[PDB]
Amino acid sequence: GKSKKWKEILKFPHISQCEDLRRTIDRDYCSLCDKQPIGRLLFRQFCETRPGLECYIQFLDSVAEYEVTPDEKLGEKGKEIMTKYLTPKSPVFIAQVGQDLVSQTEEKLLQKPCKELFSACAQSVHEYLRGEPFHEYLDSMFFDRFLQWKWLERQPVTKNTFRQYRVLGKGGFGEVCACQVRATGKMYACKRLEKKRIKKRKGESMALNEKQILEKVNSQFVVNLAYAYETKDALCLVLTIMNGGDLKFHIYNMGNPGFEEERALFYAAEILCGLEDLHRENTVYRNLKPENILLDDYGHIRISDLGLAVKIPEGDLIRGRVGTVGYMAPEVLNNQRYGLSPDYWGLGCLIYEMIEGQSPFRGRKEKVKREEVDRRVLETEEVYSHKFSEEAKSICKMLLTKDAKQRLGCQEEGAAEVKRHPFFRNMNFKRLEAGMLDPPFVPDPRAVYCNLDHTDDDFYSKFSTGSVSIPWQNEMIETECFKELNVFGPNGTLPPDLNRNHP
Numbered sequence: 001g002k003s004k005k006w007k008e009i010l011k012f013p014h015i016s017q018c019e020d021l022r023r024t025i026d027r028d029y030c031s032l033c034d035k036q037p038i039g040r041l042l043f044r045q046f047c048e049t050r051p052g053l054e055c056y057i058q059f060l061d062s063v064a065e066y067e068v069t070p071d072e073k074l075g076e077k078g079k080e081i082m083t084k085y086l087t088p089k090s091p092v093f094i095a096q097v098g099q100d101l102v103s104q105t106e107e108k109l110l111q112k113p114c115k116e117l118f119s120a121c122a123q124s125v126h127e128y129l130r131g132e133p134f135h136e137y138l139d140s141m142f143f144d145r146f147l148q149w150k151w152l153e154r155q156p157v158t159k160n161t162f163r164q165y166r167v168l169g170k171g172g173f174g175e176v177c178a179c180q181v182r183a184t185g186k187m188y189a190c191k192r193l194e195k196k197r198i199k200k201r202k203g204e205s206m207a208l209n210e211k212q213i214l215e216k217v218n219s220q221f222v223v224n225l226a227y228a229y230e231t232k233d234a235l236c237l238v239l240t241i242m243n244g245g246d247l248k249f250h251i252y253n254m255g256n257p258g259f260e261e262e263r264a265l266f267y268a269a270e271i272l273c274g275l276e277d278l279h280r281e282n283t284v285y286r287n288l289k290p291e292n293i294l295l296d297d298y299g300h301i302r303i304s305d306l307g308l309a310v311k312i313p314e315g316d317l318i319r320g321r322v323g324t325v326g327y328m329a330p331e332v333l334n335n336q337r338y339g340l341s342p343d344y345w346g347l348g349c350l351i352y353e354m355i356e357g358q359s360p361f362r363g364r365k366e367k368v369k370r371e372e373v374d375r376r377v378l379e380t381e382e383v384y385s386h387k388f389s390e391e392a393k394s395i396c397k398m399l400l401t402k403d404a405k406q407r408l409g410c411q412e413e414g415a416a417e418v419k420r421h422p423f424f425r426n427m428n429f430k431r432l433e434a435g436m437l438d439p440p441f442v443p444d445p446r447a448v449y450c451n452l453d454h455t456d457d458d459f460y461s462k463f464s465t466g467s468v469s470i471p472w473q474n475e476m477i478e479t480e481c482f483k484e485l486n487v488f489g490p491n492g493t494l495p496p497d498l499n500r501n502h503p
């Protein structure tokens with residue numbers, strides 16, 4: 001449902017409009033050719049024009065396919081890749097990897113196949129593209145086209161940029177609206193935080209914290225910020241839409257209560273990956289409970305409520321005591337200084353609750369006051385049942401270790417220590433992260449599973465940063481606005497918008 005005149009809205013500016021862009025965008029290879037979606041495509045498309053470069057983009061594609069290849073078909077896929085790219089007389093031959101590394105790769109295949117066999121060649125290839133190919137791309141019309149896309153990304157976003165639909169629930173201050181970007185037709189979930197209620201509470205720092213944690217996290221398993229704009233009355237956060245309901249509803253209304261272990265395995269795997277992405281930004285979630293794990297239209301989950309998240313400075317501890325009764329780690333209950341450990345405690349509570357259909361310290365059919373629940377979180381060992389394999393018991397109690405120093409995932413190794421746990425022994429994370437493992441439950445599309453003071457002006461300016469680069473570029477790709485608009489001249493000639501001669 002794109003706006004009637006969307007090709008006018010996303011109409012490319014003339015390349016002469018982007019000179020300021022050209023002089024300020026940092027020419028970092030990883031940013032312009034990989035991390036940024038549209039930059040990645042444009043650079044790949046530049047390599048589509050040089051015969052020598054084309055072979056390298058095809059190779060990196062086959063390596064990615066190899067990484068998520070099932071363990072049994074690794075030898076087959078490896079032998080294929082070997083005889084297709086790294087053999088000398090091939091029409092598609094990787095020459096910059098050097099015969100000194102292609103002979104090594106032939107030995108890796110002579111022994112057990114590993115999912116990392118081509119990692120050495122892949123870096124060698126990127127080491128080559130960082131040089132002459134990248135700097136050629138910079139002086140090509142595809143980087144001028146990239147600057148045109150950046151120019152659109154920077155355009156101001158406003159209330160008129162969106163199309164509000166229905167009320168998607170309510171929370172602190174305001175409610176989740178349902179945005180649709182007029183120009184592209186993509187759906188989102190507004191988060192209208194009312195201005196009069198932020199100032200009345202004096203909670204301005206809490207709004208920017210959430211907005212800034214959201215724009216930095218770039219996870220498949222955490223709600224991502226796409227836009228941040230102000231609309232006179234309220235500040236808005238445009239977020240990933242999740243129409244599949246929350247995990248609490250699926251544990252208790254759709255569950256036994258509870259899930260089969262293998263089903264909870266899948267959700268735990270995706271939640272662990274969410275926490276891992278947050279921890280890369282040394283950010284602690286602290287709100288891990290079933291109602292905050294949402295499902296999407298496909299059945300995948302994302303962590304949603306980041307209102308209690310904070311960015312921990314590197315080499316620092318914080319003091320808080322926040323969250324929900326029953327889902328506060330003991331170090332949080334005691335108001336101690338902690339790091340990321342509360343989230344691995346929450347993961348434990350989630351895995352337990354998914355398998356057993358009740359909390360490990362409160363019975364589903366138990367009327368108990370908070371004093372006893374908290375006392376239990378601090379003093380009693382949770383007990384398991386025949387719904388848990390020995391592996392499931394192990395990870396839950398390791399994650400539910402009262403002492404954060406001895407708790408799983410709270411060492412220097414981080415989330416990797418949790419992924420190694422025998423509970424994920426049958427879980428292939430590369431494939432999960434690549435979205436290749438089918439979710440265990442697919443929501444049906446049709447279903448519904450549920451003043452003038454300038455001191456405020458400086459706060460609105462730091463919030464209303466507008467578009468978020470990576471989410472925005474991905475939006476252009478999903479809606480096919482990129483495929484449709486990213487057209488050049490007939491026979492690789494410069495289109496009018498990229499020729500500095502006739503504007």
Ligand SMILES: Cc1[nH]c(/C=C2\C(=O)Nc3ccc(C(=O)N[C@H](C)c4ccc(F)cc4)cc32)c(C)c1NC(=O)[C@H]1CN(C(=O)OC(C)(C)C)CCN1
Pocket residue numbers: 166167168169170171172173174175176189191192193194223239240241242243294304305306307448450
């Ligand atoms: C599609 C959808 N998604 C999500 C939530 C989020 C999501 O997708 N990303 C997020 C990121 C962040 C948060 C988050 O932290 N928000 C907190 C609380 C907050 C803070 C401040 C504030 F001001 C407001 C909220 C939330 C989500 C929801 C919640 C729904 N909709 C429903 O469940 C509806 C459906 N409904 C109905 O009956 O059917 C209809 C015909 C469709 C109407 C009526 C009532 N239940």
